[PDB]
Amino acid sequence: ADWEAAMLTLLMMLKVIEKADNAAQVLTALWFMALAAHMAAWATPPKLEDKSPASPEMIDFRVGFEELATEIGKAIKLAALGKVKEAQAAAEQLKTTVNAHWQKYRGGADWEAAMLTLLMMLKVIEKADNAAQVLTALWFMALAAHMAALATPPKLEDKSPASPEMIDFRVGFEELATEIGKAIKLAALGKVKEAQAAAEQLKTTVNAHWQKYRGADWEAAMLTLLMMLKVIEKADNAAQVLTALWFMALAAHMAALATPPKLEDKSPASPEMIDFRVGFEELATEIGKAIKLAALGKVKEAQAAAEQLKTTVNAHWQKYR
Ligand SMILES: [Zn+2]
C-alpha cells in the first residue's frame, strides 16, 4: 500500500479520538488506525526505497512499525472494555510514537479486544437505521476477526498449535468469519432488515465462541465499493472521504483472494483468472492513490479521483457479475 497517507491517516484519526465523546467513536477510529497500520506495514517509506530489505536501517523500520501496531492493539482493548478515557489517554502516548516514527521517514489487537469489538458492533447494528451503518459495522466485525485471526485466547496460550483444542479454536473462528461474510452480502444487496436478521444469528455465534474462551465473498465487497463511492460523492469533509476510501481498501483486501461466481470453474493459472488478479491489483492501486489525496487534505481532488475510481469499479464488476 502507501506509507505516508496511512501515517497521515494515523495522525488524522488521533485528532478524531481526542475530540470523540463515546467509546464507539474511539474504538472505530482505533481500528482505522490498526487498518492503516496493517496496510502500511508492507509499504516502504520514500527515503528508504534504495535500502536493502535486510539492512539494519530498513530492519529498524520493521520493528519500529511492530511497536506502533502493538501500541494500537493495547489502546483498542482499553477502548473495547469501555474505558473511553483511559483509551484516549493511551491515544496520547500513541501520538508520541506516531510523531516520532513519521518524522524519521517523512522525507522533508489481541483476542478479546476484537471479541469485545464484535459484541459492541452488534449493538450498533441492532440500533442502526440505514444499510450503510449495517454494512460499515459488519466490515468492522470482519476487520476485528481478520486482525485477531492469528490471535490466541488467554486460556489457550499454553496449548499446542496442532492440539485439537486449539485446532477447534481455528475452525471455530472460520465459522465466525464466514458468517460475517454472509451477513455483509445481505447488507450489500440493500437488504437492511434481513442483514440485521443475520446479525441476530451472528450474535449467537459470537456469544458462544467468546464464552468458551473468555477466561465476504467477491460480489459482496464489489457492492460495497459502489456503496462507498456513493458515500464519497455525498461527503463534505476529508475525514468522511478518508474513512470510506479505507473501507474500499478494506473490501478489496478481504476479497483479494476471492473468486467471482462465473470464474469458479477456471484454472487458478488460467489467463482468464490471471487477468482477474491483475485487474484487482489495478483497483487496489487506484484506491491507494485516492487515499493519499484524501490524506493530504485534498478533499476535492480525492473525490475527483473517486470519479475515475468508479469507472474502474464499474468496468471490473460488469466483467464478472
Ligand atoms: Zn490482511
Final residue of a domain: which of 215, 241, 271? 215
Q: How far is the CA of 218 from the centre of ligand 1 (A)?
A: 16
Are residues 118 and 95 both part of a single domain? no
CA distance 160 to 167: 9
In angstroms, rounded to a whole number, what is the distance separating the alpha carbons of residues 160 and 149? 17
Ligand 1 center–CA 60 separation, angstroms: 22
Cell digits of residue 33: 488506525
- How many independent structural domains does the chain possess? 3
- d(CA 56, CA 63) in angstroms, rounded, equals 10
Contact indicator for 232, 194 with CB cutoff of 8 Å: no
Question: To the nearest 10°, the Cα dihedral for 312, 30, 103, 282?
Answer: -10
Domain boundary among 215, 240, 271: 215
CATH classification of the domain holding 272: 1.20.120.10
Torsion over CA: 219, 124, 32, 180 (sign): negative
What is the resolution in angstroms?
Answer: 3.2
Please tell me the distance between residue 149's alpha carbon and the centre of ligand 1 in angstroms.
9
- Do 287 and 299 fall within a single domain? yes
- Rounded Cα–Cα distance for residues 286 and 277 (Å): 15
Shared domain check, 262 and 248: yes
Q: Report whether 80 contacts 116 (CB < 8 A).
A: yes
CA distances from 292 to 72, 82, 216, 225, 241 (A): 21, 32, 26, 17, 11
Q: In whole angstroms, what is the distance from residue 254 CA to residue 147 CA?
A: 11
Phi, psi (degrees; rounded to nearest 5) at 165: -70, -40
Mention every residue, 6+ apart, whose C-beta is less than 8 A from residue 297. Answer: 238
DSSP structural state of residue 261: G
DSSP secondary structure letter of residue 3: S
* Helix, strand or coil, per DSSP, at residue 298: coil
Calculate how far, in angstroms, residue 253's C-alpha sits from the geometric centre of ligand 1.
7
Alpha-carbon distance 6 to 14, whole Å? 12
Same-domain status, 128 and 210: yes
Residue 203's CB is within 10 A of a number of other CB atoms, namely: 15
Beta-carbon neighbour count of residue 21 at 10 Å? 8
Residue 71 carries which side chain, given as an amino acid letter?
Answer: E
Of the residues 164, 194, 215, the one at which a domain ends: 215
Among positive and negative, which fits the CA dihedral 284, 292, 38, 205? negative
> Looking at the structure, do residues 195 and 234 belong to the same domain, yes or no?
no
The grid cell for 248 is 474500499
Residue count of the chain: 321
Q: Residue 35 C-alpha to ligand 1 middle, in angstroms?
A: 9
Spatial contact of 218 and 260, defined as CB atoms under 8 Å apart: yes
The C-alpha cell that represents 83 in the structure block: 474505558
Q: 1 alpha carbon to ligand 1 midpoint, in Å?
A: 12
User: Which DSSP string corresponds to 33-92?
Assistant: HHHHHHHHTT---GGGTTS-TTSHHHHHHHHHHHHHHHHHHHHHHHHHTT-HHHHHHHHH
Residue 206 contacts residue 214 (beta carbons within 8 Å): no
- The reply to whether 203 and 226 lie within a common domain is no
Q: Are residues 131 and 160 part of one domain?
A: yes
Work out the burial of residue 138: count CB atoms within 10 Å of its CB; fewer than 13 is exposed, 13-18 middle, 19 or more buried: buried
Region class of 228: left (phi > 0), else alpha (psi between -120 and 50), else beta: alpha
Alpha-helical segments (H) within the chain? 4-18, 23-40, 56-80, 84-103, 111-126, 131-147, 164-188, 192-213, 218-233, 238-254, 271-295, 299-320
Interatomic CA distance for residues 280 and 114, integer angstroms: 28
Separation CA 296–CA 257 (nearest Å): 30
* Residues 105 and 122 occupy one common structural domain: no
CA distance 316 to 280: 8
> How far is the centre of ligand 1, averaged over its atoms, from the C-alpha of 287 (Å)?
16
Distance 268 CA to ligand 1 centre (A): 21
Q: Which cell is 115 given?
A: 471479541
Ligand 1 centroid, distance to 190 Cα (angstroms): 26
- Return d(Cα 82, Cα 24) in angstroms, integer: 9
Q: Are residues 194 and 224 in the same domain?
A: no
Domain extent, residue 206, equals 113-215
Contact assessment for residue 90 and residue 30, using Cβ atoms and an 8 Å cutoff: no
Residue 164 CB-half CA count within 13 A: 0
Beta-carbon contacts of 250 under 8 Å, excluding residues fewer than 6 positions away, are 35, 139, 142, 143
Amino acid at residue number 69? A
Pair (117, 82) in one structural domain: no
Q: Which three cell numbers stand for residue 136?
A: 460499515
- Cell 516502504 sits at which residue? 44
